[PDB]
């Protein structure tokens, strides 16, 4: 399930 916390920014 897609989620904007995970995927609306690139995290490293």
């Amino acid at each position, epitope marked *: 399930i897609n989620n*904007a916390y995970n*995927m*609306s920014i690139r995290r490293s």
Partner: antibody
Amino acid sequence: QVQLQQSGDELVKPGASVKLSCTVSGFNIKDDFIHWMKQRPEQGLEWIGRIDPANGYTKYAPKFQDKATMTADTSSNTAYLQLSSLASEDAAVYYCATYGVAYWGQGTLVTVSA
Amino acid sequence: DIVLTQSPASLAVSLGQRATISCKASQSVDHDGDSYMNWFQQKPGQSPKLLIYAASNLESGIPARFSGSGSGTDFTLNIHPVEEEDAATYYCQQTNEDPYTFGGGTKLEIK
């Protein structure tokens, strides 16, 4: 569940500094960046930078490196944006955002005149 | 910086028809199989509202009339059928590399 409540509109004098706030409810700000965006009147959006409230680490867009200072208080779940040496091009609506960039504050208008 | 160029800057569409907005990036906004392109809607006096993230994912609360596609450097927002409440300015945004950048906006009007 998440709301960002920004501080009230401010008219500031050239040369002065101002500090805006962004109080977050429904979300522990230790758990994500808070981002700040600028929108000049009738213009487009610019990203100013982000702060990681857990450790205070910040990353600014280069054009705001000397203009903006971001801080955060994890106990009050509040983030602050300080703008220095105000000039007319600093007049804008400033937004905070978090949960990636999914949830935004209602904006704070800064106008600059004297 | 990654420069985002949105097309068209002004778009007039009839109710019921399909609106398409394009965002071209000067460099890739992909990393390891994910595209970091967002689309926002903004009405006057209101905060930008996230529509689509990671190029094609529909944000909670947004109807499926909105859809996103593309990868790499070329991305597209489609709205259909267009309804009165879609009149707004739309922005693309990339969040792959710093500084994050926005396109210059597309104003959607009803014809």
